[PDB]
Amino acid sequence: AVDLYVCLLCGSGNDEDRLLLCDGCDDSYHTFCLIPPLHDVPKGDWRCPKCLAQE
């Protein structure tokens, strides 16, 4: 894992450019490999559903 952040769903490393970090919980995923969003990163910090339940 040369890249400081990798996608747990894939962990390619190149996709790190669009890898989104979850502030609600330590979870990283690509905008096109987990959430509807795609090449364009969504505004605000996206959080996986489990974190939403905490709030």
Alpha-carbon distance of 12 to 16, in angstroms, equals 8
51 phi/psi in degrees, rounded to 5: -70, -35
* 18 touching Zn ion, by CB under 5 A: no
- Rounded to the nearest whole angstrom, what is the least distance from the CB of residue 19 to Zn ion in the complex? 7
* 35 touching Zn ion, by CB under 5 A: no
* 41 touching Zn ion, by CB under 5 A: no
CB of 27 closer than 8 Å to CB of 51: yes
Contact set with Zn ion (CB under 5 A): 7, 9-10, 22, 24-25, 27, 30, 33, 47-48, 51
